[PDB]
Design a binder for this molecule. Structure first.
Ligand SMILES: O=C(O)[C@H](O)c1ccccc1
Ligand SMILES: [Co+2]
Length: 327
């Protein structure tokens, strides 16, 4: 089965705006591009990289193409979470066996997943379905950080268990941990799934329909269905990163000073970074505001100092920061 996430592909209405924020604010570097001059007539795509995180930003160049249809439905959104496989044929078979729809058969392959996401399957390197014109930066060595810590996915009520069962069977990503999180009168249920290697961690999040609609329901109506709510990037110095990023225009969600009174500490306070711990050490986390029109996808920065999993105290204070922002 898949060892790692190869890349995430963002479908967008305006790649100037979307890639501009990822490059000029977050610091991603363009590596390669595809478009009419490389034989890809219906869209322009750009591969961006930072450390080991690869994002592909893709914009339709004609109305009523699949990309254009996707973006009209969902807004700017992740449409593809690509898996790197030691043996693609084997990954594809195991996935179809588990009930994954065959969206394109091994010509590299594409299977379905939660909501209308795609999972392109690729050798564990740029996407294999299009031909790429390289930038000079593509020919140079990349840092080991940042790396993609986990992907958070919003699911419709009553689909959490069967989504998790699918990911266990299709991709060998079994249960890792679960949390039930309450904010005000709303709540959400989540399961973290993770493969044996630890290369792939998803947060599967469903809203609790026995409580009052909240931020997960809002995500689902804005995005118009299940989708990726956030990508989290693992960094060595989240305080430093949040300082430089803040300088390049990045808006992070704020936490009240109250939280810091309870809880180095002056550094976290200043940066609105959240701290929690597991049996093996601490983790620091922060969310950015969504930079997209519908207020859906956003980014997370995480630093692990020994922590292997996730802390229920950070999850709650993150979800509180999103609600303060939502209002
Ligand atoms: O970062 C995490 O622990 C996790 O993906 C998460 C999901 C939903 C709200 C807050 C946090
Ligand atoms: Co997260």
């Amino acid at each position: 089965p898949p060892s790692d996430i190869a890349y995430a592909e963002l479908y967008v209405a305006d790649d100037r705006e979307a890639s501009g924020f990822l490059v000029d604010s977050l610091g991603f570097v363009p590596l390669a591009v595809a478009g009419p001059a490389t034989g890809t007539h219906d869209r322009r795509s750009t591969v961006l990289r930072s450390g080991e995180v690869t994002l592909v930003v893709t914009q339709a160049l004609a109305p009523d193409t699949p990309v254009a249809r996707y973006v009209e439905r969902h807004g700017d959104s992740i449409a593809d979470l690509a898996f790197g496989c030691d043996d693609v044929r084997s990954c594809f078979d195991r996935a179809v066996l588990a009930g994954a729809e065959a969206l394109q058969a091994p010509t590299f392959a594409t299977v379905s997943g939660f909501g209308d996401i795609r999972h392109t399957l690729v050798p564990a390197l740029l996407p294999p379905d299009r031909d790429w014109a390289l930038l000079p930066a593509a020919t140079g060595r990349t840092g080991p950080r940042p790396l993609l810590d986990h992907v958070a996915v919003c699911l419709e009520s009553g689909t959490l268990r069967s989504t998790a069962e699918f990911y266990e069977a299709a991709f060998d990503m079994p249960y890792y941990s679960s949390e039930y999180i309450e904010v005000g009168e709303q709540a959400m249920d989540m399961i973290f799934v993770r493969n044996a290697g630890g290369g792939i961690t998803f947060t599967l999040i469903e809203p609790d329909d026995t409580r009052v609609p909240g931020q997960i329901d809002q995500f689902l109506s804005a995005h118009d269905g299940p989708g990726v709510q956030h990508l989290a990037f693992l960094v060595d110095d989240i305080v430093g990163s949040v300082r430089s990023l803040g300088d390049r225009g990045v808006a992070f969600l704020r936490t009240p000073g109250a939280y810091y009174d309870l809880l180095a500490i002056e550094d976290l306070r200043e940066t609105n970074v959240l701290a929690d711990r597991d049996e093996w050490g601490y983790l620091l986390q922060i969310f950015t505001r969504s930079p997209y029109p519908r207020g859906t996808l956003f980014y997370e920065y995480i630093q692990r100092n020994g922590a292997r999993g996730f802390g229920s105290s950070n999850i709650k204070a993150l979800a509180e920061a999103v609600e303060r922002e939502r209002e």
